[PDB]
DNA sequence: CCCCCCTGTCGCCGCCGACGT
DNA sequence: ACGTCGGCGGCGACAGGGGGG
């Protein structure tokens, strides 16, 4: 629960401080390699494949291979070309209704909480967004990588926090080009009505509590057994 | 495109072959580690702390570190006690209304394709899902890592293809533990009026066609020149 | 028949939170 | 208020293996 950001929503001259937080913590256990035979921990050393000598991180040049198997070293001017990462602000772009963003695009979510002193503007903006029911699409620059996103409010009963849902660039989302479904499919009318009771026989209400990763809990119990 | 796997939905008697595909391909450019002195692609060697020698992938042992840091030598036979991952079926569990999954949980989107020469069952399932307007929650499994998902249908121009959206285990979604907002701040109606004025002055409608990553295009042009 | 893409590691840099002045 | 210090986490790259042609 340690922050990752400290910027400010800024559409004009507003600049409400916000502390971005990771909204999805993976309880999945990450293991570690080791040379158990001799009881020796493992480390990775970068070694030349052709010249065959170990090297340090500095020497290796970030290189790109094209269809011709070329290699170009990326210099500092590539960083200098885009100045957008130099900004520590979530530069709001536009305000749109929340219904205009499909669930196809959502990629990740973070929770924004403010600097304790500037709570007034935070709550005022969140209240205005909730009352007028508006998306607030923004930009986002975390660790020098500009990702589109969307800022939308969400009441939590006692408190109402606004959150940022990162978005995939509209071009990235793939388009389904499947000719099999295009060919005509004919179904007799009495056939369709049968499936209704089939699905209705299993209908229910989505409850988060019931579902749980049996694999992970079993692994946790097993490792507890090992110790 | 290229399928990630090819299984078949299954809830009791019902069955239907499906052919999943990747629906989010990131065209961000992958580079390779090279060093100027010789311009040779880097190579990685697994090297041993205690014994100070290269130790193969096969000769490498997996382990775990707990709070105390004590190493734990794990074995493959014991971990594999779970038999579900061996299943190659999208074993549907229940059917629920589509509007009962908040956008918090959606993780990845995957297309579906009927496999057999006949897609009658697939089309019928898509039609019933579209009519009744109910999501179908499934225990999607892939690459021996079972992960909860949900089946939903959405038309794309020419087809009524249905898609499976992976989901986050509800215990994964954190909560906003923040005692800084529960405090109530005095506010004035004029403040709300001016705030609404400023907010709606900049209001507009979503036009995704004009949204692109400037950095990616800049890098593409730079590499094209080089 | 296959070569691509998940998945897991590793190492690294960059950033935050508390202690002390 | 301001300066130090240690720790935590995105992420870029590689390696391995599966299941797709």
UniProtKB/Swiss-Prot annotation, chain A:
| Sorted UniProt keywords | DNA damage, DNA recombination, DNA repair, DNA-binding
The GO annotation for biological process reads: DNA recombination; double-strand break repair via nonhomologous end joining; positive regulation of ligase activity
Domain Ku span(s) in chain numbering: 10-193
Q: Under the GO molecular function aspect, what terms does this record hold? A: double-stranded DNA binding; protein homodimerization activity
Q: Where is this region: Sufficient for interaction with LigD?
A: 111-227
Q: Which GO terms describe its cellular component?
A: DNA helicase complex
Fill in the subunit field for this protein.
Homodimer. Interacts with LigD in the absence of DSBs, and with the isolated Pol domain of LigD in the presence of DNA. Interacts with Sir2, possibly in a trimeric complex with LigD.
| Task performed by this protein | With LigD forms a non-homologous end joining (NHEJ) repair enzyme. Binds linear dsDNA with 5'- and 3'-overhangs but not closed circular dsDNA nor ssDNA. One dimer binds for every 30 bp. Recruits and stimulates the ligase activity of LigD but not of T4 ligase or a human ligase complex (LIG4/XRCC4). Attenuates the 3'- to 5'-exonuclease activity of LigD. Stimulates the template-directed addition of dNTPs by LigD on 5'-overhangs and nuclease activity on 3'-overhangs.
Similarity comment text for this entry = Belongs to the prokaryotic Ku family.
Protein known as: Non-homologous end joining protein Ku
The opening ranks of the lineage are: Bacteria, Bacillati, Actinomycetota, Actinomycetes, Mycobacteriales
This protein's gene is called mku
**Boundaries of the shown chain within the full protein:** 1 to 227 of 273
């Amino acid at each position: 629960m340690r922050a990752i950001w400290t910027g400010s929503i800024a559409f004009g001259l507003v600049n409400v401080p916000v502390k971005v937080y990771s909204a999805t913590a993976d309880h999945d256990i990450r293991f570690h390699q080791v040379h158990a035979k001799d009881n020796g921990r493992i480390r990775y050393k970068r070694v030349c494949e052709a010249c065959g000598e170990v090297v340090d991180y500095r020497d290796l040049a970030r290189a790109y291979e094209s269809g011709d198997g070329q290699m170009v070293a990326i210099t500092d001017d590539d960083i200098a070309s885009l100045p957008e990462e130099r900004s520590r602000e979530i530069e709001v772009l536009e305000f749109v209704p929340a219904a205009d963003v499909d669930p196809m695009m959502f990629d990740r979510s973070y929770f924004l909480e403010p600097d304790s002193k500037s709570s007034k503007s935070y709550v005022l903006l969140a209240k205005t967004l909730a009352e007028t029911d508006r998306m607030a699409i923004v930009h986002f620059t975390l660790r020098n990588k500009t990702r589109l996103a969307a800022l939308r409010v969400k009441d939590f009963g006692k408190r109402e926090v606004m959150m940022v849902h990162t978005l995939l660039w509209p071009d990235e989302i793939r388009d389904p080009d499947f000719p099999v479904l295009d060919q005509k499919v004919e179904i007799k009318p009495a056939e369709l009505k049968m499936a209704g009771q089939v699905v209705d026989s299993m209908a229910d209400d989505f409850n988060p509590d019931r579902y749980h990763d049996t694999y992970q809990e079993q692994l946790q119990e097993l490792i507890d057994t090992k110790l």
